[PDB]
Design a binder for these strands. Structure first.
Ligand SMILES: [Mg+2]
Ligand SMILES: [Mg+2]
Ligand SMILES: [Mg+2]
Ligand SMILES: [Mg+2]
Ligand SMILES: [Zn+2]
Lengths: 64, 225, 129, 267, 102
RNA sequence: CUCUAACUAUAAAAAUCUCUCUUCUC
């Protein structure tokens, strides 16, 4: 199948990673807007973007 | 992954076509007597399943047997002994606490007192019972610790031991379980040691079982329905 | 009860290669044993949350085909004389079990904790690293 | 044109061992071409490339050379492979070697056939190699049989009978083998007449020798008589040596001496 | 010289106590010198509380906690961030770090 | 002038180093 889902960030939880080049945000689904995840992003984001996810059960873990 | 040195030192089937479900029936001392279902191989003439069922020990939360949630942290093990066909009967096998509650009450700055007693009930069932109690900070104790001296602990152990012996030798595990459900032994043990020491959280945990006399069908069927 | 056919999830999450192993109430019958190392490549991420996630999806699918609709979680650490703290993957395994339609009842921790260890491996000075 | 994969389908299976020629290396990994199968590309990643710590890639991979690998995931829509290299057991590489070697032989033979007949390898493989692989699991055993027993060409349709004739000619030209089966018998005779005994023994030995394979009893030591045979069929020479041993036993049993055995007939 | 008048052990009048093993490196360390941390946590964290609540029978099921007293080593305690090097006038303070949250 | 609640979770490898030291009295 093609379970491509979307998720609009509601807040950005600083920038993580050893490189210092990835960030961590709290995304909320376009559907069921009470269901949120924490996810890692690689690039410039701000409050308002719509990420595309091929997963929904994954949660972000701080990169070391 | 998918790695295996193949150090071996299609005839494939689905093992669920040759299987079915039996039902677990609780003793009448509990309310929700419909416990659950158990998966079993299909009956074979050479080896009958009903032989294989007997001896099974199902582990069920006590609150799942009485509907309430005051018995959430307890747990009861039932023994499969008699199969009526598409429905089997379970006798009491043991009791235990949930580790969550046990660790929840085993806290610092108070002495835990443990009482152990191996006894014989009114019938020839032989049981082992463990009781656990915790000294209680008084409702006026500005002193922060709540420790108990060794003399108080030994006296409390003696009292709990004699109470447990009394309430085992004077009843059967049918009546004993019917007594365990409303944990009146806990209240009685707390009251009998009220003068010695406060003793918060007097509980009876891990009611073991060490022997069964014979196979008495009459009371087992009498215990159901 | 509305005939929720029950099982026990019985997760075992060591510090490597967590286990998801559902059984009936008795526990004498084992179905859908698929583990963490069953589904992930690196051989080092058997403990990873993704490993337990895929293992959990497989056991959920297999049990749903069976007929069992609700499960009882029995989380176990490696236990014994070992670390006995729950593995990283077990929590993801439980979350994915609760995701895939299955109903959840009576989470318990059943790690084998001793009244004492016989002897803990590593010597008196332990693992020097 | 080397194409038309060895197996009955152009795509891999989920667990197989394979061998690969590297074509290039990128930063995330190398998308390289499979040789156990025809040409389909797939990734080997650096994290699952080397056994030890990946300090260098030029020393390990050696682009343009042949390595062992396995396949973990497959794209069965347009063709893409996920492969592995660290998970090759000590036993895996040996059977990979033998499988690739037999495949390479059966590939080079039919590549010569295609080049001499100027017909694409696809049709030739579909007409000859595929039914033989169906019948006996692999065409090389069929080639060995055709060397020995010629019934293997019954029921198979070539594009033309000239193709079969030229292929049989190349079988006779290229796959020439025998096996040097050697045994050593201890002579222990101290009897009265003992040279006419050996003379009669090898007179009988060369009497039974078939036209296709020779029988000669070589002398290296007075006790140690060596028997060397060129097993063309690899199963009748042992019978030949056993019959010779029977004859020598019949010779020695009545002159007055005895003999012993050190090396029975062994390849 | 004495870096610690308490010598670190916190024994003062026993002579010998029974050692305990490290959770990480399994170092046989005396039970009083060893750093003990009581990890009481939730068997399911806030990351899955909503999911479990929606997908669980027994409405308002009080989910259980998990309790473990961890007996760390001391090299491990420095390395695993459990305990930190302190100023020489700050080593005086033995009160825990002021109630992380109220 | 009355008060005990929240939380996790990193240990790959790294050996050695030939000078030469110089005054404070208003
Ligand atoms: Mg160190
Ligand atoms: Mg010093
Ligand atoms: Mg200290
Ligand atoms: Mg003293
Ligand atoms: Zn340590």
């Amino acid at each position: 199948k093609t379970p491509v889902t979307l998720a609009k960030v509601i807040k950005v939880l600083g920038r993580t990673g050893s490189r210092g080049g990835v960030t961590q945000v709290r995304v909320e689904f376009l559907e069921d807007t009470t269901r949120t995840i924490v996810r890692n992003v690689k690039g410039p984001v701000r409050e308002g973007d719509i990420l595309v996810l091929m997963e929904s059960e994954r949660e972000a873990r701080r990169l070391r | 992954a998918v790695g295996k040195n193949k150090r071996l030192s299609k005839r494939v089937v689905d093992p669920f076509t040759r299987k079915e479900w039996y039902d677990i029936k609780a003793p009448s001392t509990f309310e929700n007597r419909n416990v659950g279902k158990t998966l079993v191989n299909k009956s074979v003439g050479l080896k009958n399943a009903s032989d294989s069922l007997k001896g099974r020990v199902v582990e069920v939360c006590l609150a799942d047997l009485q509907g309430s949630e005051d018995h959430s942290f307890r747990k009861v093990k039932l023994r499969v002994d008699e199969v009526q066909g598409k429905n089997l009967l379970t006798n009491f096998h043991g009791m235990d606490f949930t580790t969550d509650k046990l660790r929840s009450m085993v806290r610092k700055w108070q002495t835990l007192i443990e009482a152990n007693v191996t006894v014989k009930t009114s019938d020839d069932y032989v049981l082992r019972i463990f009781a656990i109690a915790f000294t209680r900070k008084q409702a006026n104790q500005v002193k922060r610790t709540s420790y108990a001296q060794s003399s108080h602990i030994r006296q409390i152990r003696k009292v709990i031991s004699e109470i447990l012996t009394r309430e085992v030798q004077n009843s059967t595990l049918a009546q004993l379980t019917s007594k365990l459900i409303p944990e009146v032994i806990n209240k009685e043990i707390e009251n009998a040691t009220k003068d010695i020491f406060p003793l918060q959280n007097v509980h009876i945990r891990k009611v073991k079982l060490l022997k069964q006399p014979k196979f008495d069908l009459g009371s087992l069927l009498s215990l159901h329905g | 009860d509305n005939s929720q056919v029950f099982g026990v999830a019985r997760i075992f999450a060591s510090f490597n290669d967590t286990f998801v192993h559902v059984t009936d109430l008795s526990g004498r019958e084992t179905i859908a044993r698929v583990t963490g190392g069953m589904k992930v490549k690196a051989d080092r991420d058997e403990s990873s949350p993704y490993a337990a996630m895929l293992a959990a999806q497989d056991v959920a699918a297999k049990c749903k085909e069976v007929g069992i609709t609700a499960v009882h979680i029995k989380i176990r650490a490696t236990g014994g004389t070992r670390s006995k703290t729950p593995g990283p993957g077990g929590q993801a395994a439980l979350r994915a079990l609760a995701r895939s339609g299955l109903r959840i009842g009576r989470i318990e921790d059943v790690t084998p904790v001793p009244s004492d260890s016989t002897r803990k491996k590593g010597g008196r000075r332990g693992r020097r690293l | 044109t080397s194409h038309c994969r060895f197996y009955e389908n152009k795509y891999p299976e989920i667990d197989d061992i394979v061998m690969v020629n590297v074509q290039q290396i990128a930063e995330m990994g190398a998308y390289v071409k499979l040789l156990e199968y025809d040409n389909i590309e797939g990734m080997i990643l650096l994290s699952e490339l080397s056994r030890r710590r990946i300090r260098s890639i030029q020393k390990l991979i050696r682009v343009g050379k042949n390595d062992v690998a396995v396949v973990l995931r497959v794209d069965k829509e347009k063709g893409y492979i996920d492969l592995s290299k660290r998970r090759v057991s000590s036993e895996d590489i040996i059977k990979c070697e033998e499988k690739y070697q037999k495949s390479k032989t059966v590939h080079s033979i039919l590549r010569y056939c295609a080049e001499k007949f100027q017909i694409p390898l696809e049709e030739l493989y579909k007409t000859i190699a595929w039914p033989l692989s169906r019948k006996f699991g692999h065409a090389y055993e069929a080639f060995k049989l055709s060397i020995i027993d010629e019934t293997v060409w019954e029921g198979i349709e070539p594009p033309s009978k000239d193709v079969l004739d030229e292929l049989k000619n190349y079988i006779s030209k290229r796959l020439t083998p025998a096996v040097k089966i050697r045994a050593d018998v201890e002579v222990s005779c101290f009897s009265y007449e003992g040279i006419d005994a050996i003379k009669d023994a090898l007179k009988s030995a060369e009497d039974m020798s078939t036209e296709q394979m020779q029988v000669k009893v070589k002398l290296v030591a007075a006790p140690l008589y060596v028997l060397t045979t060129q097993a063309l069929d690899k199963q009748k020479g042992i019978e030949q040596l056993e019959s010779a041993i029977e004859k020598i036993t019949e010779v020695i049993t009545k002159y007055g001496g005895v003999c012993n055995i050190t090396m029975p007939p062994k390849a | 010289p004495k870096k610690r008048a308490s010598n670190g052990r916190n024994k003062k009048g026993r002579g010998h106590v029974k050692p305990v093993r490290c959770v990480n490196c399994s170092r046989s360390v005396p039970k009083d010198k060893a750093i003990k941390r009581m990890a009481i946590r939730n068997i399911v964290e806030a990351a899955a509380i909503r999911d479990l609540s929606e997908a669980s029978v027994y409405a308002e099921y009080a989910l259980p906690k998990t309790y473990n007293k961890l007996h760390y080593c001391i090299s491990c305690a420095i390395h695993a961030r459990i305990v930190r090097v302190r100023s020489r006038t700050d080593r005086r303070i033995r009160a825990p770090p002021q109630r992380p949250r109220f």
